């Protein structure tokens, strides 16, 4: 018959179609339910029952299907700090019921936290060492108080856990460091600080199974943060010093099937690694469809290794 | 010559006192801070450096030694959802500097979310079937909405992440119910619901490094919460089925040094597991000065794993 595939992710990207005639343990077709976070609830009960039900708006059609997903794959980002981002409760859930999933629900819960993740990456970095790992120079501060020990200007300041450029400020003085430090007192979170980077390109090295990919991303907006706005995206060929990076940040949290390393590449020539991503990572360049195409093949490589008739 | 070990835990329990005398490496001295989450504050740097900062009331109002721990020992809940009870910003931080500690930063930060440590307690359930491994079934709701989803009653409502009894209210009909519903959605966050079994006592099996320990609780108050006002408490003997419990729960997010499995003794002659406990179970009985020995020894036993000269 059928298996049950939740996939969390934009309605932009069908991904019925990207399953459309495949079977996975010879017979069984594939049934994928698509939705956002926001989209979604669920039940769980310790003794192996759930239920998921959906709620989306298709063509004027409010659709509030219900369903009982065998495997999750997530495109999204299970929490932020901004409004209506925080869907831990949900990503618990599907522990709580046992789904197995891509990326494992392990390392989501533990994705949560960028400065979690970053501690990850430190603990690769005093393992490779610089010339193989360059990790950026960073600062944790655990709140607003302890800011008062200043990194060397310029910084960029990322305040808390968000995306898309939110919470980043690029500071260039000592005032303008107290400033957003009183700031950050308000948001009563977390803040990192490391070394502004003048830069000649972005750097985004990609792992999807065994596939890896390396692009590179120009501004054209003379904005310093290189996303939104506008930006010349062209992708550049895999070295084995790139490979290696992205290699050795996918073993954490027990294993990331789908990952990226984000570098800046400076005026000085050198790299930067600045922070890991992991399934929520977009798909971009001109080869998406081939990416798709491959995290397809991962999923039903993973349901066969993983579920039962 | 000597190992900085911070010990994160209350003032009337004088770690300074069980380590004096005590080496590591041979000849190095072992140098305990000792304070709780509410008085620390630290910063953390990429490149490895890091510092901590203690300020408790002495000299005056506020005083504030600094220093720098080679080791943590934490005894204290890090996460709770009452007033001023997160504490997850330092844990962050000291995994951001790569501390060594006792349990690993690693398995604190995954105790944080009750039902995630429980979702774990689900699959060992699932492995080793009910009779070896009796956990009390839960349902597990998102949030309040999926509280439509009517469970059989009498249950024990247990709202979000807190301790001591609080935020759990015991739940006869379901109109009673449809108004902790409401109210777990000012709370605005997820909540269990288990049956309300009428017992006889409470168990509680501890794990020490390879020291065990069963007691047992009988209450004289009245309601229901045992832990509440006078109750008789008792070392009791092991057993394997004991054993096996807390062996098992050990196990997860790499594993646990220090562990406790709960659970309620039944009037229908039956045992039933409601819940795991990590480092940050107090010590209690009358073998506590033992069992801070036992402690002692795991975290030279564990500095002399882990540190360098
Ligand atoms: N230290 C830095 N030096 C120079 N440029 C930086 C630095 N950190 C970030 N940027 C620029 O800002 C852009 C966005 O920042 P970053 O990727 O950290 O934020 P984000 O919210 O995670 O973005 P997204 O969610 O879109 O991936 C980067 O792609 C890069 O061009
Ligand atoms: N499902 C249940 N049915 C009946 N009693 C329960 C149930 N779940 C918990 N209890 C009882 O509720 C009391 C409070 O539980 P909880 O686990 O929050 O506290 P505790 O850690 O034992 O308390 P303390 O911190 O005082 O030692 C306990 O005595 C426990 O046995």
New interface residues.
Partial sequence: KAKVLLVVDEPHTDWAKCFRGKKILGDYDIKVEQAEFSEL????????TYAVDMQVLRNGTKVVRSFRPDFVLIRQHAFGMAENEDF???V??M??A?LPSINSLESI??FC?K??V??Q???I??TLGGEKFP?????????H??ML?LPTFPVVVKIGHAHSGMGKVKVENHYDFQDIASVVALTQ??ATA?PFIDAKYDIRVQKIGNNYKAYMRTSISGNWKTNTGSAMLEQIAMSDRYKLWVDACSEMFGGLDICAVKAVHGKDGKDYIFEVMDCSMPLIGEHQVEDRQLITDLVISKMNQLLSR
């Fill in positions: 609830n669920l039940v769980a009960h310790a003794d192996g831990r409760h949900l618990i859930g522990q709580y046992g819960y533990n936290d400065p979690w970053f501690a990456m430190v603990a970095f005093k990790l950026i120079e960073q600062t944790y501060y655990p709140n108080r302890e020990t979170t977390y490391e």
